[PDB]
């Protein structure tokens, strides 16, 4: 709570309204504070481009559509456009072409909604075609936190299944793991932890083979992946160019470099895209349907995202795209060098580290002291650094290597050191589910208290 | 209708080369100098809820400034976690808060469909955990917004829609009879989307608190103007937390908070229930993870929208916005009940809807449609409704709604069968079989999408 003390807390609305100026003031006196971290290269993720005249472009576009709610498509048809749009062209990056012109979907508010949409989808498609009533899905250990938000919103039974050596999926697993009440199987393109593709062509086969579906969570690799097979690197097929594939899930505001707000969910078809859509007919309300979880949503998101798109092309997101990998391999390369250092698997730009000879968490804590604010994994312990633009920019990468270099230094030095975040991470990496679970719950309470 | 199809190019592929940003926006402005008169002067039901280009600007700088954020990540913006955590705690406390004991708490949402999706999950998760309850049903009037239903089907609960009286206000007599041991909460609208009207809460409150279950205040329309109408003077009843038997309630800052669309609260009257509310992950590779609601990276700039909105207004701004509303209201009803062969469905406050007995008022509609009019169909009755907001208290606004009304009557009574535009389509929809309506809308929506 860094400002508690320099800024007053409103606990209560003001008698009076407090002035604009004011109110932009500080708001403003935080963001001089904040932004330094994600604009210098700081931040693993977070921040996707974060260059000066990329934002003030999508703050203008914002502004011209701020009051866009695509609720209301009689109102606000350039919304409705930019969503159509954004979809299409999404499609086409991801093998839509290759199913023959059928590939539909909807622009949805992030990652989690778009993995949250397919999942329902799969699961009403289920019990609609197949008599399905108690739906089981299947996906790997690494697949996105927001497959157990589904199961346990969708009451959808979900089946984790273990890792190969190189923390890819292990796909006989997944088939031992498949009954008559499984409705989908997912792979990751690539994981968030590690960072490493699955064998989504193995995945779609086994689906294809056993009539279900085959979720591709792109969030992560979506806008990056098309653009890493033109330039020459290897990534196995991961999209509608497998039979098999029946959703993929991207994010528009990760690597397509849109707002915060925005993501896209793919069909193969029409007829599975439409078990997604809500429609209430006997609402005294009058007629009233959604495509998405949301009512009203914020129309301008999708105006950014449809307006970033069209800003870099091919060219854009091939150049972007180019420009991490480089930088990827830089850093990987500089890792790979550091002694009792090791890389989880074979990432190509999320960068999972870890050490079997060094407390990785206290190798963390001193790259923290550095300023670096990264992402603390587990099973197994590591760190991972999702690079972004910020991350290419001039001097970056050797920075973090030598503060790396540094940290490892220091670890190894006092093997027994563990400061400030290190416990913390230790502590959460042994105890008990439900011990986190209640410990996280205050945490979560405290983000919250006003004083 | 897609009007910017022989305007604009369509884009179904990305394009080879990115675009020019000026060109981009200047698109962008061109729908946008098209598209803001029909909100801006005051054509309009709901929509746009403040809509004054001060405030627009206002909001559209605090965007601006906090255009990266994303409160997953608390520790990069902790002016974002600041901003969430005062909203909830001046919208608590607006609503009675303090009669609770200071037990109230929640959390900011991406809208009133999420707050009403996370209330419904909650009582159901709740339920299951302390009352062993596992095939969970709801009780709420037929008028309750249809996310209600969307809840139903996304969490499996039973939804038991009951009958209004007279007056179109819920019969608490018939929800009482609909209570069996497997319901976990009933609700009540304060108001209603469809006809404007505060359900009876304090009876409804009170049924819940005799049956320990959970009570819902859906007060996404009204949270911003019952407690200033009641201090106006304006007979409105308790609706909120002074209730003792009021559990949770929604409120749009995205609606008369006069915030930026993408918000709302939801709130409880204790923490324990919160507590079913969040999401957490334990055991997940990636590390811990947790969310307050559906989502997990979210835009931030939003609630910064919502909180400064809200800041700038104060007690005394919601206040001279409710008694514009209000008297803009007053006058519209008067205005209304002058005009021969129409009626207004019970006794509302500010969102009016208006009905005929003699005329076919989907024509009525057509011919205001025709006027620039901008209203919403209603079905269950037949009817259309207006919800005012500070676009109807601009100068004039209301007596040319008047005058064009009279003369849609007058037309309509001149040529009772005739029927044009929309009037026969939303004629069928109130006749269609639910069923025969999905499929068709269906169709709607793919045609929305198509490029």
Redesign the interface.
């Known amino acids: 709570?860094?400002?508690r003390d320099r800024f007053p807390?409103?606990?209560?609305?003001?008698?009076?309204?407090?002035?604009?100026a004011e109110?932009?003031a500080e708001?403003?006196a935080?963001?001089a504070a904040?932004?330094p971290?994600?604009r210098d290269g700081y931040?693993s993720g977070?921040?996707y481009h974060?260059d000066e005249?990329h934002?003030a472009?999508?703050?203008?576009?914002?502004?011209?559509?701020?009051?866009?709610?695509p609720l209301?498509?009689?109102?606000?048809?350039?919304t409705?456009?930019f969503?159509?749009?954004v979809?299409?062209?999404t499609a086409?990056?991801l093998g839509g072409d290759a199913a023959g012109g059928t590939v539909?979907?909807?622009v949805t508010?992030?990652?989690?909604?778009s993995l949250?949409l397919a999942m329902?989808t799969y699961r009403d498609w289920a019990r609609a075609t197949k008599g399905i009533t108690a739906p089981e899905a299947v996906v790997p250990?690494?697949a996105?936190?927001?497959f157990?938000?589904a199961a346990?919103?969708?009451?959808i039974k979900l089946v984790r299944t273990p890792l190969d050596a190189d923390y890819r999926a292990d796909v006989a697993a997944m088939r031992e793991a498949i009954t008559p009440n499984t409705v989908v199987v997912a792979g990751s393109a690539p994981?968030?932890?590690?960072g490493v593709v699955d064998p989504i062509p193995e995945i779609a086969a086994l689906a294809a083979e056993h009539g279900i579906g085959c979720h591709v969570d792109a969030c992560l690799g979506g806008f990056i992946l098309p653009w890493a097979e033109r330039l020459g690197y290897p990534v196995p097929p991961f999209d509608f160019r497998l039979e098999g594939v029946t959703s993929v899930s991207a994010?528009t505001?990760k690597y397509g470099y849109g707002?915060?707000?925005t993501s896209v969910i793919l069909y193969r078809r029409?007829d599975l895209l439409?078990y997604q859509?809500?429609?209430?007919?006997?609402?005294?309300?009058?007629?009233?349907?959604?495509?998405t979880?949301?009512?009203?949503?914020?129309?301008?998101?999708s105006?950014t995202a449809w307006?970033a798109?069209?800003?870099?092309?091919?060219?854009?997101?091939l150049d972007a795209t180019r420009r991490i990998l480089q930088a990827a391999d830089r850093l990987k390369a500089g890792v790979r060098a550091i002694p009792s250092l090791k890389i989880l698997g074979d990432p190509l730009w999320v960068i999972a580290v870890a050490s079997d000879e060094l407390n990785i968490y206290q190798v963390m804590e001193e790259m923290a002291g550095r300023g670096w604010?990264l992402?603390?994994?587990?099973?197994?312990p590591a760190f991972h650094v999702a690079l972004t633009l910020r991350h290419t920019e001039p001097g970056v990468v050797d920075r973090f290597l030598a503060d790396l270099q540094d940290a490892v230094a220091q670890v190894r030095a006092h093997p027994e050191k563990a400061t400030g975040m290190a416990p913390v991470?230790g502590m959460?990496a042994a105890?008990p589910?439900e011990l986190?679970?209640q410990v996280?719950?205050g945490?979560?309470?405290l983000?919250?208290?006003?004083h």
């Open positions: 709570k860094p400002y807390s409103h606990a209560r609305l003001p008698r009076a309204g407090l002035p604009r109110i932009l708001i403003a935080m963001g904040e932004s971290a994600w931040a977070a921040v974060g005249h934002i472009f999508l703050n203008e576009v914002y502004a011209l559509q701020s009051q866009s709610n209301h498509p009689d109102l606000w048809p350039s409705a456009k969503e159509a749009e979809v299409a062209m086409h990056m539909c979907g909807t508010s992030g990652g989690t909604e949250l329902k250990v690494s996105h936190a927001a157990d938000k346990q919103y969708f009451g994981g968030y932890p590690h994010d505001h707002a915060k707000g029409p439409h859509y809500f429609i209430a007919a006997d609402w005294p309300g009058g007629l009233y349907f959604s495509p979880f949301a009512g009203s949503r914020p129309g301008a998101l105006a307006a798109m069209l800003s870099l092309g091919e060219e854009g997101y604010r992402n603390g994994l587990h099973r197994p991470y959460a105890a589910p986190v679970r996280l719950t945490f979560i309470d983000l919250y208290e006003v």
